[model samples]
Every structure is written in structure tokens, then in C-alpha cells.
Target: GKKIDFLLSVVGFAVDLANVWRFPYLCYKNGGGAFLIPYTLFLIIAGMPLFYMELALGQYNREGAATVWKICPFFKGVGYAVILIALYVGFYYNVIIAWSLYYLFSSFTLNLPWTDCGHTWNSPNCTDPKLLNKYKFTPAAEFYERGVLHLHESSGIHDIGLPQWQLLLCLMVVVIVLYFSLWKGVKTSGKVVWITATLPYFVLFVLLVHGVTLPGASNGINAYLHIDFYRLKEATVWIDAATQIFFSLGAGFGVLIAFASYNKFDNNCYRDALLTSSINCITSFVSGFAIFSILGYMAHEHKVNIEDVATEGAGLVFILYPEAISTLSGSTFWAVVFFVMLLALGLDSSMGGMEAVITGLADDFQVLKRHRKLFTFGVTFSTFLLALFCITKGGIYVLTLLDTFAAGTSILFAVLMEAIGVSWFYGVDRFSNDIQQMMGFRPGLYWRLCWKFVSPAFLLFVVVVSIINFKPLTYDDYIFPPWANWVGWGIALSSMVLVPIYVIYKFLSTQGSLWERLAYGITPENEHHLVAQRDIRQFQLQHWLAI
Candidate 1:
């Protein structure tokens, strides 16, 4: 019944730690000025259109994406696969968020060890066990430069081994937070976002104001938008864009479908999808200003290379940002704000992920639907128990394995599946018509071309190049065996295997003739007709945008 509210409630779910902290630095690292042009183009061409399609499909059908996908039997299993992948990834992703909460607590320490000097009177550095005994509180100082070592560590930058206990404690706290919040379901999620979704804005604004005033903030900003045509020409640029599109949006989880189910008949999700994508990208740009300025200041301080400071790994925000905050003015105050923001940001993101998978299961199995709360709890507990492997000692290795193979690859497969389902099987013309019917006018020729031709071709090219050029040419060195190459294939197959298996079962068991349609009895329309069609072209909402 409360349509956009649910979307609004969970909006922060997809816009978590990634947006505010890590992505900006990524933009900085990958040819800073160079990355933005491709990034922006992709957000419009691929990101916005897919988001619009998902929101429109969900609200138009008033059902889960998986249930809604049943209208087309050719790709029915993609829905379930997406939801399940989210479940698997969300299981550990929550633990990562829990680590953020632990750091938030760490932010409140009397003073960070990073701020104190190790010169003469500041004698104890990271190497000295005696350094731990004589720690002192020192306020953050200002610096201006362009190097990575200065950007990532303390003034005397040193390799700090992983904080194992802190991460473990954090994971425990996350499980408990998620368990209780969802014990009551959407009602609780809705209330929780009141704090979760909105707090980031406040903290972000504070950081933004202070960051821009720092010595080298403008240099960082310049670096952030600096475009390198050569890097832009590389195929990985497209893959990066495509991956970000999928990971940053809940394209696979079917959450949009569930959220849309809560909307009223007249609600305009077509517009919301466009606005959300634009807002998210715009916010990322604004946040880049905050992230890299502090980074640039740090770079100036240490005189290390700028590229060394930039990172795109999932741990970028978690491991890097806290250390950066420790060297800022009012180090304790700012660190607390940064981590608190991270905790709040993950709230909606973490909960919505749990909601997406659980809701999908409920929609699919009538037994689960009838016992929603119990089923949800059961899934959560099972996940927590399984997650213990990643939560234990040597958990970082486990986490790395899951992220490298299972989590990242699953999202990629889901996105590819969605593009395949919507572009090939469902029919792009039909999709365009549904948009016109809902929005009161037809979209432009450019978007049709992007949705039909440009996006898919780009996706395919990236996947291929990412494979052939898997090894690094220069700068840094990391390698994997030939067998490791199968990780992506395994993930794609595991997520996709469900669709065909179920279809085959339907073919064997059902009494209907080969020509007969197999459709779910719940959602009003078939997969191809998820959007309502009767007399749709008659009404008008105003002008049509290519979003």
C-alpha cells in the first residue's frame, strides 16, 4: 500500500558504504579524470535504462521479479538465481557492515595511535611493541601533496597488519542487529531507515565542507575528474561500468519487485528509477570531492605516489578511510562521524538485502509465504551459521574467496541474465511500449538504441576482454592459476543452473501440452505482459524522458 515509501526506505540499501567512501577513490585510481567520462556515459545508457526497466516491471506487475519473470518461460529461472545469489552474498556482506560498526566504536577511542608522532620525542612507531605503552593523543594536522603512500597511511606510513579480533567482533554485532530489526519485518525496516538512510547525508555534508577547505582538496578534485583517453579506450572501462551498474543497483535481488508490490496503482516508478540513478551518480561525484581531498592532503604529507593510495577493492572504505580519518583535524570527532555514517548507511542496505531474498522465497513457495516470519528467521540463522566459516580465523581468506569467485561473479551473471531476459526474450519494443503506457509518452530513439544494441554489445565486449587480458601488464602484480579462471564460470552456472532445471521439470511433470503456457496464478499478467496494456496509450502524465 505504501509504494514509494518502501522504495525510499530501502533506497539506502543499494547506496551504502560503496557510494560515500570507496567509489570516489576508485574514480581517482583508474585514471581519475579519465574514469568519469565513461562512468557517466554508462550510468545513463546502461544503468538508468535497466533501473527503469526493473522498477517498471515490478510496479506494473505488482509482484516479485522472479514471479514476474514467469511471464516468459525462456528465462524464468534467472529470477530465482538472482534472489539466491543476493542471499549468499548478503550473508557475508552483512559481516563486512558489522566491521564498519566495530570501527565506529573504535572511532571513540581517547585518540588514534595514527595521530601521534614517532620523531625523537615521538619515538615509538608501528614497529615498536613499546610504542603501544607510550601512546599519546595528538590533533590531526594539514598537508598538501600528490602521492599514494601519503594518501593511505599515517604521516609515517607503515604496513599495519589486519585487525583480526576487531573484524570478528564486528561481524557478531551485525548478525544481531539484522536479526532483531527484521524479527518484525518491513514495519521495522521502514522505521530503521529513518535513521539509516538520512544520517549519511548529514555526516556527508559535514565531511564535504571540511574536506574542501583542506589544502589540496582542489588538486584531488582535479585528479578525480581527470580523463585519460587511452584508459577510457580499454575494455575494462566498460566492464567496470557494467559491474558497478549491477552491484550498485539491486538488479538481481528482486527487491524492486517486492517494494513495488507495496505501491498504489497510480504511483510513477518510471520517474523514481531515473531520479534514483541520477541522484546516486551525482552523489558519488559530490562524495568524490570529500574522499580524494582528504586523500590528496595525505598524499602531500607523505610524498608517496598517488596511484598507490587509490583502491577499488571492497575493503577500500573499511580499511582505508578509518586510517585516513585518524590524521584529520579533530581526528576523534571526524573518525566517529565517518564510521557512524558508515554504520547508518549500511542499515537499509543490509536489511533490504535480507528482505529481498526472504521475500523472493516467500513469493515462490506457498509454504514459506504462509509462514513468512518463521521462514525469514530460519534463512537468517542458517546464513549466520554458515557465515561462521568466513567469520572465524583465516576468515579473510574465506572472505576473499567468496568475494572473488562467488559474490562478484554472481552479480555479474545476474546482470547479464537480466539484460538477456529483457533485451532478447521479453522484446525491447514491448518494454518501450510499457514505458510509454506508464509515463504517457514514448521514450527517445537514443535510449531504444542503448537498450537494444549498445548496452548488450558493451557488456559482451567487457566480459571477453576481462578474460583475455586477465594479467597485469605493469605497476602491481597479482596472479591466479588456470583453474581459478573457472570461478566466474562456476558462479554463472550455479546462479543460472536453477532456471533450466526448473523448466525441464515443468516440461516433464506438467499435464499441459507443449504449446500450452505455464504461468503463475498470482501476478495478473504473463512474463511478457507484466506491464498492464489496456487503454494505456490514452492517458498522459506529461512529457516523456529517455530515462
Candidate 2:
């Protein structure tokens, strides 16, 4: 019954807001079409190999993140390491859903609120984008900053003002929905996916159709895929590809493993994994076109350059698209359409991480599963409560730093440990044998090679390159003080430290000498001397030579 009961749910996590916002930014910032070269290369070398392993891990083990460490029992400590990652992201990630929820309700009106600069939320600085001589901003920008956030009330992250009531209520709806959808477990979330995941494509197609028909759709797309072949010459472009592929596919956080771990034991996960990743990539590509077309129209509509209208994340999704929709013939309809899409995009991603957290612990012990609703409530309630901080006036700063230090920065290190555990410690031979047991065929040498040597090497490469590239954190123009950056690193290490600390605790607690403990620690729980002959298969050269 646990068979891909929600193959639908497994399909949603990898194609979240990053596909819409961040993926395009990475591509457009780099070489666009030219960037595809390194991206697909990463797809083959690291992304799919690791992703396939994660999928098979869950499918075979029938366990969530932490419990799945039964392959190499001592690595169980790192299980909670990944569990913490999924938990920390929920603190700030769902804020986007709340904002989109608020916007969805706001769009019910005949006239959109930010259509003109004549409302209470409108600041004195509100004006046309072309009228830069007046030192003014657009109505939509004012609505988000002044009306939505009330950002003027807080001086900075240090002075995060009280949470706004409207945003809090919107977030409350989010938690309630997440709890109900997940409390009954995968089945409930899959029902949610049926509704939440399917609705966005209609809106996407509508956007692409309308967007391309506009003045600068072609230009915007040209800029989106514009090939600066020389950009590939830089090391950072390849690095960006590797990072985006991981996050964009949403593999690093253990969500997929959790989702698919309940999969039908004999499901052709090879085919399943291929289908999902392709859809995610295609979605990113199409969404990129839809988004940038509007950017082109925005730039042309106001007589500004493409770069002038372009931005990274929130600005593009909120400030840019909402303003663009306001100018269309049926502002209310378009507003509702895109806002719903945003909520859908955010919710699916939210629920993906939500599943990771719920299952991360639930599958660890039967008690959590028995009182599942309460555990679900506690997780959702905690996330909702902590997220109250992000809804404050300067909560965006909190959100930014959380984004920087918590999941994005820590996931590589986390996944690197996961790869090392399975490929090295658990032994790729055993893993491949596990997959062969289910898939009816062994993984090829290429996948084995990628899993063993290439993936971990490039993972460390990305990790080191990212660390060296780290600079003082900033949001647009605001520079976070040095202390805040230090606090962020603490946040990063808090999750990262779990593995090594547990490694020591697990080692010392074992009833054996150091050498015996080493053997005992890395051995699978079921493979103790009784289950098979005395030989440790991993130590034999032929096991490594299976390919």
C-alpha cells in the first residue's frame, strides 16, 4: 500500500519556487543557453547519480531520513543532521506562502490594490517608474514594502518590529493546511498535491501565452537564453550549475528520499527518477521563459533597460510580476491567476520540506507514527510560531540570513556526508546490490563511478569554492553587520556538527575495542555475523571490483 501511493507527491518537491525565481537568475546571470552545457553535465555527473541513490535508499529501506541510516548504522547520527535541515528551512520558507495567501485574497476585488498610488498603503514616494526625477517608486513596490510589510517601522534586523496581524493570520492558514494535509501522512499530502500541484500549469501556460504576445516577450526570452559562451570559461559558472541543480531538484534536503522511501518496493525507480527530473528541468525552462518575457515587457513598457527591470528573487516574483499584471486588461483575473500560482509553487515546496520533517522523526520510531497528528501539530505549530519573527517589519532580514546560513549553505555539507556514508562507508557495492534487488538490474559503471569518486570530489569542490566565495551578507543595499554573519555561521554549524559528535558518541557507547567498534559501526544492522558468514564483504576487492 505504501507503493508510490502518491507518486504525485514525490513529483512536486523538486519543482518549487527555485525553478521559478532562482533558476532563472542563475541562468540569466551566467550564460543562459550556454549555461545548459555545465548544468546537464552536472545533471549526469552528480545530480542524478546521487538522486537515484537517495530514491533507492528509501524505496528499499522503507524508512525516512534518520532511520534509513540502517545501511551503515553509525551514520545514523547524521540522519538527524539532515532532519535538522528540513526543520530549519520551515522557519522562513513558508513566509512566501503566507504572502501569496494574502495576495490571493486581496485579488478578489475588481481593482487590484496596487493599481495606483492613491491608497493608505501608498507612500508619498509612489510614482511611475519612468518618473525617476521625482525619487519615487511604483505602487506595487509601496504595497509590498509599506502596505504588506510595514518595513518603515523597523530600523533593521536588530529592531524587528511586532508581527503584523494580517500576515500572521495568513501564516496561520498555512500551518493549518500543512497540518491537515500531512497529519494523516502521505495520503493526505498527496490529496493536497492533486489540488495544489495541478492548478499551476494552467496559469503557467496562460502566462506564457500572454507574455510572449507582449511587446518584449521575444527580447526577454533572448536575454533569458542569451548565450555568453565565454561565461562558461569562468569556474563559478560550473559551480553555480552544480549548486542550482541540487537545490532546484531539491535532493539535498532528504525530501525525495522520505517521499519515495514509501515507494512500491519493486517500482522501476530508474524510470521514475528519470521522469521526475526531466519534468523539473522542463518546468524551470518554461517558467524561465514566462517570467523573463514579463521582465522584457516591464522594461519596454517603461522605457528602461532589461537589467534595470531584472532582479533576483522576491523583487521578481512580487514587485515585478504583480506590477506587470496590474497593467493588463483584466488586472483582477490575472492577479488571481498568478498569485494562486505563487501560492501553489510555495505550498508544494513547503509541503515537501514539511514531509521531510514529519517523516524524518516519525519513521524513526513507531510512537511518533501512532500519535502522528500531535507530532504533525507540534512541527507545524513550531514552524508557524517561529515564522512569526519573519512576518515582522524587518523579518525580511531574518529571512535573508536564515536563507544564507541555514539550508542553502548547509545542504551541500549535509549531502556530502550522505554521499560519503552510502557510497563509501555503506559501500556502493552494497547500495548497487540493494538497487539491483529492487530494479531487477544493476547500476552501470558510470553511475557507480559518479557515486563513488566524482560526486564527492565535486561536492567538496562546490563546498570549498562556495566558502571562499562567501562575502559579507547583504540584501540589495543593506549590509548586515559582521556579528550577524557570525551568528549565521553558528546556525550553519549547529546542523553540521551533529554527525561528528554523534560519530564519537556512537563509537564510545559500543561494547567493543576500538578496532572491533570500527567494524561494528560501519556494518549494517541486519548484516551482523549471524545473518551471513563471518566474512566482511566490504573488505574484499571483488566487492569494489563488481563494476
Off by over 4 Å in 2: 1-14, 24-37, 129-136, 229-240, 530-534, 540-546
For 298-395, candidate 2 gives per-residue lDDT tens digits of: 77765777776644434456776776677678788888878877777777788888888788898888998889889888888889988997999888
lDDT string, candidate 1, 1-547, tens digits: 4775665554554366557644654565566656667777777777777776777777766667567765455456778887877776776677667656755664577766335445332322323322343111121221110111122231211222233455556666777778788776677766665565567777767767777776666776677666678887775665565565566666656777677766666666667776678767777777766777766765554444556553444455553455466546777887777677677777667677788777777776889878877887798787776566555433433444455555444555556667766755555666778767766666677767776677777666665666565542111122334444465457556875786786676566645444333322212243325323322211223212223
Residue pairs in steric clash, candidate 2?
3-264, 58-261
| Cα error, candidate 2, residue 313 (Å) | 4.0
Q: Candidate 1 at residue 22, lDDT?
A: 44
The whole-model lDDT of each prediction reads: 0.60, 0.77
